[PDB]
From a paper:
Neurexins are presynaptic, cell‐adhesion molecules that specify the functional properties of synapses via interactions with trans‐synaptic ligands. Neurexophilins are a family of secreted, neuropeptide‐like glycoproteins originally discovered as α‐neurexin ligands and later found to bind to the LNS2 domain of α‐neurexins (Petrenko et al, 1996; Missler et al, 1998; in the following we often refer to α‐neurexins simply as neurexins or Nrxns). Here, we determined high‐resolution structures of the complex of neurexophilin‐1 and the second laminin/neurexin/sex‐hormone‐binding globulin domain (LNS2) of neurexin‐1 and examined how alternative splicing at splice site #2 (SS2) regulates the complex. Our data reveal a unique, extensive, neurexophilin–neurexin binding interface that extends the jelly‐roll β‐sandwich of LNS2 of neurexin‐1 into neurexophilin‐1.
Because the structure of the LNS2SS2− domain of Nrxn1 was known, the structure of the Nxph1‐LNS2SS2− complex was determined by molecular replacement with the Nrxn1 LNS2SS2− domain as the search model, resulting in a well‐resolved electron density map for the unknown structure of Nxph1—roughly half of the amino acid content of the structure of the complex. This electron density map was of sufficient quality to build an atomic model of Nxph1 by automated methods. Visual inspection of the Nxph1‐LNS2SS2− structure revealed multiple key interface residues. Among these residues, I401 of LNS2SS2− interacts with a particularly deep hydrophobic binding pocket in Nxph1 (formed primarily by Y249 and L251). Mutagenesis of Nrxn3 LNS2SS2− residues, corresponding to I401, T405, and Y407 of Nrxn1 LNS2SS2−, resulted in decreased co‐immunoprecipitation of LNS2SS2− with Nxph1. These residues are all located in the LNS2SS2− β10 strand that is part of the hydrophobic core of the Nxph1‐LNS2SS2− interface. Of these mutants, I401Q had the greatest effect on Nxph1 binding to LNS2SS2−, nearly eliminating the interaction. Nxph1 binds Nrxn1 LNS2SS2− with nanomolar affinity. While glycosylation of Nxph1 may stabilize its binding to neurexin (Reissner et al, 2014), we were unable to produce well‐behaved Nxph1 without glycans on its own and thus could not assess the effects of glycosylation on Nxph1‐neurexin interactions. The I401Q mutation in Nrxn1 LNS2SS2− greatly decreased binding of Nxph1 to Nrxn1–3 LNS2SS2−. The primary sequence conservation of the interface residues suggests that the Nxph1‐LNS2SS2− binding interface is maintained in all vertebrates.
Residue numbers in the entry:
A (entry chain A): 280 to 378, 394 to 487
B (entry chain B): 118 to 180, 191 to 212, 217 to 263
């Protein structure tokens, strides 16, 4: 049913964006995560001036976006607890020419300004999920280590295409490459020997 | 001129709703003002300010750069009613005027939001990519 994968800190997905560039006036990223670790990179897309970086940082959800002329950084956290509580949490990030929106469970922020510029929402370089090469620190990544925990239904969507990255990794795609080996289920995180 | 205007932000939980608007005004004398208005309803603390791009995004219990606050007006109404006994609702309207000396124009907007269910900090730098 749902496309899930468990990352153990040495594994990541990489969807080849070189031979198929992506451009749009708006885009959207959705995923659910479950984890016990305080820090870890969940998703990065973009090696250009444009990028989106989504990570856990000290048990908070961290989002860093470079949307053309401007930059956005947010940190989100429950008040009496953290997001590395071994429970699923749902993330949705929406960008367009005038506005960025992020929601994590019961909190939503929408922020924008009049840009008055011609810009392109795209990325040439690989779309990374769950981690990234160790000798490759990605633009705007606040954390330096790969994810440990579960990611589910990672989907990137724009006005041209919709990529079910979690599904593609589970099934297979010549542009979808997996570093290491990951189980396409959510393992009991309390026991990650 | 400037790379942006008519800044807006909305942060929403079921416990606190925050609406922010921001406006720039170039006075033509080497200074410009940034005006923030914000309205919040519910429970929790909210703040909006100007910061340099080097400001670290982090949570904080407390409350070179050529911008300073010249005027601030805050109106806060508190309604106390017990839920099941306690319990309260806060309505807040703030206006803040920042005055900036123009030689430096790379300013960021920093918003904090501490409710009873969620907390969020965010930094928006609208023309940062004119910095480098």
């Amino acid at each position: 049913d749902a496309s899930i994968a468990t990352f153990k800190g040495s594994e990541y997905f990489a969807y080849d964006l070189s031979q198929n560039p992506i451009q749009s006036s708006s885009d959207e990223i959705t995923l659910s995560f479950k984890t016990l670790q305080r820090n870890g990179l969940m998703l990065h897309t973009g090696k250009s001036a444009d990028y989106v970086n989504l990570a856990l940082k000290n048990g908070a959800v961290s989002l860093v976006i470079n949307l053309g002329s401007g930059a956005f950084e947010a940190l989100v956290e429950p008040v009496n607890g953290k997001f590395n509580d071994n429970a699923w949490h749902d993330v949705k990030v929406t960008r367009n020419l005038r506005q960025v929106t992020i929601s994590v469970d019961g909190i939503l922020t929408t922020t924008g300004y009049t840009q008055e510029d011609y810009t392109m929402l795209g990325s040439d370089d690989f779309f990374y999920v769950g981690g990234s090469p160790s000798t490759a620190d990605l633009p705007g990544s606040p954390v330096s280590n790969n994810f440990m925990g579960c990611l589910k239904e990672v989907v990137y969507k724009n006005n041209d295409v919709r990529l079910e990255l979690s599904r593609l990794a589970k099934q297979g795609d010549p542009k979808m490459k997996i570093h290491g080996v990951v189980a396409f289920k959510c393992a009991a995180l309390e026991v990650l020997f | 001129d400037f790379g942006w205007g008519d800044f807006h932000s909305n942060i929403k939980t079921v416990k606190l709703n925050l609406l922010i608007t921001g406006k720039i005004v170039d006075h033509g004398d080497g200074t410009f003002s940034v005006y923030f208005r914000h309205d919040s309803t519910g429970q929790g603390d909210v703040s909006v300010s100007l910061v340099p791009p080097t400001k670290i995004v982090e949570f904080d219990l407390a409350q070179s750069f050529n911008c300073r606050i010249e005027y601030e007006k805050v109106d806060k109404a508190t309604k106390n009613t017990l839920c099941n006994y306690t319990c309260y609702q806060e309505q807040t309207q703030s206006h803040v005027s920042w005055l900036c000396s123009k030689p430096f124009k790379v300013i960021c907007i920093y918003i904090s939001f501490y409710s009873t269910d969620y907390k969020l900090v965010q930094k928006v730098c609208p023309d940062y990519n004119y910095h480098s």
